[PDB]
Curated annotation (Swiss-Prot):
Disulfide bonds: none
Gene name for this UniProt entry: BRD4
Cited function: Chromatin reader protein that recognizes and binds acetylated histones and plays a key role in transmission of epigenetic memory across cell divisions and transcription regulation. Remains associated with acetylated chromatin throughout the entire cell cycle and provides epigenetic memory for postmitotic G1 gene transcription by preserving acetylated chromatin status and maintaining high-order chromatin structure. During interphase, plays a key role in regulating the transcription of signal-inducible genes by associating with the P-TEFb complex and recruiting it to promoters.
Species assigned in the record: Homo sapiens (Human)
Family: Belongs to the BET family.
Tissue distribution: Ubiquitously expressed.
Glycyl lysine isopeptide (Lys-Gly) (interchain with G-Cter in SUMO2) cross-link, chain position(s): K57
Domain notes: The NET domain mediates interaction with a number of chromatin proteins involved in transcription regulation (NSD3, JMJD6, CHD4, GLTSCR1 and ATAD5).
Site, Acetylated histone binding: residue positions: N98
Location of the Bromo domain: 16-122
Oligomeric form and interacting partners: Interacts with p53/TP53; the interaction is direct. Interacts (via CTD region) with CDK9 and CCNT1, acting as an associated component of P-TEFb complex. Interacts with RELA (when acetylated at 'Lys-310'). Interacts (via NET domain) with NSD3, CHD4, BICRA and ATAD5. The interaction with BICRA bridges BRD4 to the GBAF complex. Interacts (via NET domain) with JMJD6 (via JmjC and N-terminal domains); the interaction is stronger in presence of ssRNA and recruits JMJD6 on distal enhancers. Interacts with NSD3. Interacts with NIPBL. (Microbial infection) Interacts with bovine papillomavirus type 1 regulatory protein E2. This interactions may serve for the tethering of viral genomes to host mitotic chromosomes allowing successful partitioning of the viral genome during cell division.
Ranges annotated as spanning the membrane: none
Disease linkage: Cornelia de Lange syndrome 6: A form of Cornelia de Lange syndrome, a clinically heterogeneous developmental disorder associated with malformations affecting multiple systems. It is characterized by facial dysmorphisms, abnormal hands and feet, growth delay, cognitive retardation, hirsutism, gastroesophageal dysfunction and cardiac, ophthalmologic and genitourinary anomalies. CDLS6 inheritance is autosomal dominant.
Protein name: Bromodomain-containing protein 4
Length: 124
């Protein structure tokens, strides 16, 4: 049931290491990574382990912080907005598949609040 994980290395993509991208890796992701509620988002959803054969039949653009981290470390992104879009996909996937008030949603919401606080001001 588990599809292959999203791509994290692509030598053909045009890469950059902007100040903003470095900050997203060194400050934003690494602080989120240590949050008490980070653990469900640190790797792709393992639908086999969770016995959720429906998950990837609903969520067609999966994303997780482990993937974002590998992408940042591989300079996969051209700008910070591309990386922020991946974070937003991760959060939105959770809000789509689950319902308001579910425990996993409360965890995603806590992470998102921290994420939005940290990216409110980015380097120049
Ligand atoms: C809804 C839940 C299945 N959920 C999820 C689960 C995990 N991992 C995990 N492992 C053991 C127990 C639990 C668990 C069990 C009952 C209540 C709350 C958590 N969750 C990792 C990520 C996700 N995300 C991001 C989702 O959107 C969906 C797929």
């Amino acid at each position: 049931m588990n599809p292959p994980p999203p791509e994290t290395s692509n030598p053909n993509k045009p890469k950059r290491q902007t100040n903003q991208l470095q900050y997203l890796l060194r400050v934003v992701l690494k602080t989120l990574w240590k949050h008490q509620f980070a653990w469900p988002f640190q790797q792709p959803v393992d639908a086999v382990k969770l016995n959720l054969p429906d998950y990837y039949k609903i969520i067609k653009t999966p994303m997780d912080m482990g993937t974002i981290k590998k992408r940042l470390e591989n300079n996969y992104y051209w700008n910070a907005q591309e990386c922020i879009q991946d974070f937003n996909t991760m959060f939105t996937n959770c809000y789509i598949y689950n319902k308001p008030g579910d425990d996993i949603v409360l965890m995603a919401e806590a992470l998102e609040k921290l994420f939005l606080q940290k990216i409110n001001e980015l380097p120049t």
